[PDB]
């Protein structure tokens, strides 16, 4: 199959070889931030940045897109039951299709609700961030992600915001808007998924806001001045106001 020639194929092969030769796993880093406050990491060597309960701040039962289909299913049920149009048996069976698919939008919205970052912590060293969420079935799932994997999105979320010089928070530290951020690869439950967009809600509290912005900017932080908080105030699967 290699007998035929294409200069596009040759260029692609050369580019692939160049990428395999030059682009390496070990890469130098330049975006480095030195914080303005000595950070007191918790007993597990972590500093909390954003705490939120989006479930407590979400309209779950009565949603906008799902309600329309969820209510319209009865109309199709009645049409099939009463045969108002006087169609054939096959046509009635076809008309029965609508009720069997209505669950898809509600399921999609509920799944989307799980991607919101409920809790965010930064471990010692300023390279891995722990994001914890809760699936609406009450499934507490946490995952550690690399610092470089974050990329901000615009307030309109229609275009990728600049990785630097973004102003997504108020001066005091509160978030200026419900922010969306893209992660290239997130290891959820051990399985890596590509190009996943997470959201931080405005209702969340930005504890130690500056580092959070550094987490938003994606630059690595210099964890020089670190204190240790000796308080095991967190219990194993401790109950949370988000439920």
């Amino acid at each position: 199959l290699n007998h035929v020639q294409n200069m596009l194929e040759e260029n692609l092969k050369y580019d692939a070889q160049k990428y395999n030769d030059e682009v390496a796993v070990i890469q130098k880093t330049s975006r480095i931030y030195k914080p303005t406050y000595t950070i007191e990491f918790n007993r597990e060597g972590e500093v909390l940045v954003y705490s939120a309960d989006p479930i407590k701040n979400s309209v779950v039962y009565f949603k906008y897109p799902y309600v329309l289909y969820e209510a319209a299913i009865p109309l199709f049920i009645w049409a099939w039951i009463y045969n108002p149009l006087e169609l054939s048996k096959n046509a009635v069976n076809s008309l029965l299709i609508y009720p069997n698919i209505a669950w898809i939008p509600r399921m999609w919205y509920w799944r989307s609700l799980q991607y919101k970052i409920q809790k965010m912590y930064l471990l010692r060293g300023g390279k891995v961030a722990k994001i914890e969420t809760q699936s609406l079935a009450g499934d507490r799932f946490t995952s550690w992600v690399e610092t470089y994997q974050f990329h901000p999105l615009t307030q309109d979320q229609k275009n990728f915001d600049n990785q630097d010089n973004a102003e997504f928070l108020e001066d005091e530290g509160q978030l200026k808007y419900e922010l969306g951020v893209q992660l290239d690869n997130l290891q959820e439950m051990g399985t890596t998924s590509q190009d996943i967009v997470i959201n931080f809600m405005k209702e969340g509290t930005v504890h130690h806001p500056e580092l959070f912005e550094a987490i938003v900017k994606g630059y690595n932080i210099d964890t020089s001045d670190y204190v240790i908080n000796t308080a095991n105030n967190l219990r194993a699967r401790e109950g949370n106001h988000n439920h």
Binding site: L12, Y19, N20
Partner: protein, 674 residues
């Protein structure tokens, strides 16, 4: 110095001859006279494969016969159809499932699972392994071989005259009496040492006073002067006539037939009803099978009582489920085998000595024979289906890396089911008309038997949950076995109703129940255990693609052939019928198509075995030596080793970024460039 030998070719030929002699010696040592359990099991497995192929061919023939109403295949040979049905039943039950399971699984596992050195009587084990072929062949030749050897078009009249010794009886008188012997020499020759064939054709020849109807094939006796062959050559296919009429009787020997898997007296127990032939052959084969089963049971049970390891003396809960089922079924077989043998001996005595052991005239009763057969009947099926449950239980625990649901409860349930199977004799003979008390007791015992099966199903389902699932080819087969066992239990429970049984006794519903319980569950479990232990038995890793194809086609074929049968049973199609009304054509054709799909799946499994042999790649235990992560350190070590082995295995594969770039830039066919 240099040696100039004239024949380096002869040197190489001598080397080849020495290789041949050494190969013959080594083959006799490690494949003929070997006492190794592994070698004996491998031989038994190959023989079982051959026997199962023969049985599947018989089943395919039956399905083709039943495919279309009007007897298109058997051409109305009802006796041949009955013989073929009996042969299929006996070969699959008494020569396929029992041989394969017992020989292969026991010989392979008892040395390993029971942890005993070889067998209790290795000589007996080898004897049985070498002896099974005789019964295998004998039970498989009945459908093609019959005492009525001549063909329907074979004009046996031309040759049978030569067989008549009464033609020359006269000279027999004077052989030892010579006083008037010469007087016999003074007679006139009419038929003395002569054969005159009457005109077989209407010849209107006025010039011919006599017409020679003698066989043209025997015109020159000189040709017959040295031919050491019978006169049937002249009687074998020397006419062009053909009777393509379903009304034309093709047997004329209606007494020569078979009485199915269970010998039904007095039809089987009377020469007038069952002629000499297939019935006697089957009785002798049953006797031989009983002897072989006794030998196997002694060889197996003797080791378990004596050759147990230091720690496995009494606590049977430690042994694997398959081995426990093996021991329990061995005990159960040791129970009913003497009764089956005595019943066979009595049937043979009735057939050949006329003891009236089944004649209602002077004391006998067919109910006695039916009761004996049923006392051998239900325990046989119960023992047969038992090992597959242990196989499935052993397969599931390793795949999920979790403890079984209730091992002691499952073992006790299996033992209770075995104990209960000895009291369901009247269940299969509900329509024989026993005393109403006996019928009620039998029905109540049959209904209560489902209590252990529900425990087993619940235990399997519960053990399948809350575990670390590692999907292998074995897991899918175990799931298929469970799914097949689900329907069979419901069908059996429904058939336990007295009214439903009276409405469906001895019908296609019963046929479907029996097939789905045996052909589906047991064969599926056997295949699962084969895949679960493919490496140790074969030495090479299985072929993933062909194994998946086999697991797909085999699982589907069973349902495809059993659903139409159950549907016809709901329509009340009688069992063991050579033809059916046209109303059953659709379901019969669906069942035939399912049987063909099952045959295709078997071919796929054979191709899978061939591909696995051609692969020659070492297999690695997915458990990696830690089948249970009972500790956090064990779980961590398993995770680390799995990550390392994945990184090593995923070496040389293009990286994620490069693969994505290539996949994106795949399309390179553009019209005009810059």
């Amino acid at each position: 110095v240099s040696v100039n030998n004239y024949f380096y070719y002869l040197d190489r030929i001598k080397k080849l001859f020495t290789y041949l002699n050494d190969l013959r010696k080594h083959i006799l040592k490690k494949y003929v006279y070997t006492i190794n359990h592994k070698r004996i099991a491998i031989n038994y497995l190959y023989f079982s494969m051959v026997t199962g192929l023969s049985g599947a061919a018989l089943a395919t023939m039956i399905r083709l016969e039943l495919a279309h109403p009007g007897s298109p295949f058997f051409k109305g040979d009802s006796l041949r159809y009955l013989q073929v049905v009996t042969a299929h039943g006996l070969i699959m039950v008494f020569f396929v499932v029992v041989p394969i399971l017992f020989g292969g699984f026991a010989n392979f596992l008892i040395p390993y699972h029971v942890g005993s050195k070889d067998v209790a009587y290795p000589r007996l084990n080898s004897i049985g392994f070498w002896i099974q072929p005789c019964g295998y062949i004998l039970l498989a030749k009945i459908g093609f071989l019959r005492p009525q050897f001549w063909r329907y078009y074979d004009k046996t009249s031309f040759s049978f005259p030569f067989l008549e010794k009464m033609k020359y009886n006269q000279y027999k008188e004077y052989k030892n009496d010579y006083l008037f012997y010469l007087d016999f020499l003074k007679k006139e020759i009419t038929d003395d040492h002569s054969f005159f064939w009457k005109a077989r054709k209407v010849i209107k020849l006025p010039q011919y006073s006599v017409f020679s109807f003698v066989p043209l094939k025997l015109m020159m006796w000189k040709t017959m002067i040295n031919y050491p062959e019978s006169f049937w050559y002249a009687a074998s296919r020397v006419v062009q006539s053909r009777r393509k009429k379903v009304f034309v009787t093709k047997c004329s020997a209606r007494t020569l037939t078979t009485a199915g898997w269970t010998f039904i007296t007095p039809f089987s127990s009377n020469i007038k009803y069952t002629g000499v032939g297939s019935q006697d052959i089957l009785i002798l084969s049953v006797v031989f099978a009983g002897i072989s089963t006794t030998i196997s049971f002694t060889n197996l049970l003797i080791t378990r009582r004596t050759l147990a390891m230091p720690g496995l003396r009494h606590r049977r809960v430690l042994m694997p489920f398959v081995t426990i089922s093996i021991f329990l079924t061995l005990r159960m077989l040791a129970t009913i085998t003497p009764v089956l043998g005595a019943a066979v001996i009595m049937m043979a005595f009735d057939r050949h000595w006329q003891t009236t052991f089944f004649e209602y005239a002077y004391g006998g009763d067919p109910i006695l024979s039916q009761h004996l057969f049923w006392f051998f009947g239900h325990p046989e099926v119960y023992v047969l289906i038992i090992p597959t449950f242990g196989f499935i239980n052993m397969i599931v625990p390793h795949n999920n890396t979790r403890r079984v649901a209730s091992k002691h409860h499952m073992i006790w349930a299996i033992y209770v089911m075995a104990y209960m199977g000895y009291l369901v004799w009247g269940h299969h003979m509900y329509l024989v008309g026993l005393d109403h008390r006996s019928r009620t007791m039998y029905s109540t015992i049959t209904i209560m038997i489902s209590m252990p099966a529900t425990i087993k199903v619940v235990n399997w389902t519960l053990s399948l949950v809350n575990g670390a699932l590692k999907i292998d080819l074995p897991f899918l087969f175990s799931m298929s076995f469970l799914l097949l066992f689900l329907v069979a239990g419901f069908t059996g429970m429904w058939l336990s109703h007295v009214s439903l049984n009276v409405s469906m006794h001895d019908t296609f519903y019963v046929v479907a129940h029996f097939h789905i319980m045996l052909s589906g569950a047991a064969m599926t479990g056997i295949f699962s255990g084969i895949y679960y232990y493919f490496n140790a038995l074969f030495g090479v890793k299985y072929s993933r693609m062909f194994g998946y194809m086999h697991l797909i086609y085999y699982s589907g074929g069973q349902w495809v052939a059993f659903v139409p049968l159950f549907y016809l049973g709901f329509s009340g199609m009688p069992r063991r019928i050579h033809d059916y009304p046209v109303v059953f054509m659709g379901w019969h054709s669906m069942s035939t198509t399912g049987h063909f799909i099952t045959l295709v799946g078997i071919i796929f499994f054979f191709l899978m075995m061939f591909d696995s042999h051609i692969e020659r790649r070492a297999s690695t235990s997915t458990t990696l030596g830690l089948p249970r992560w009972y500790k956090r350190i064990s779980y961590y070590i398993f995770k680390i080793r799995y990550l390392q082995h994945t990184k090593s295995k995923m070496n040389g594969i293009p990286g994620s970024t490069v693969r994505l770039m290539l996949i994106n830039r795949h399309f390179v066919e553009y019209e005009v460039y810059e």
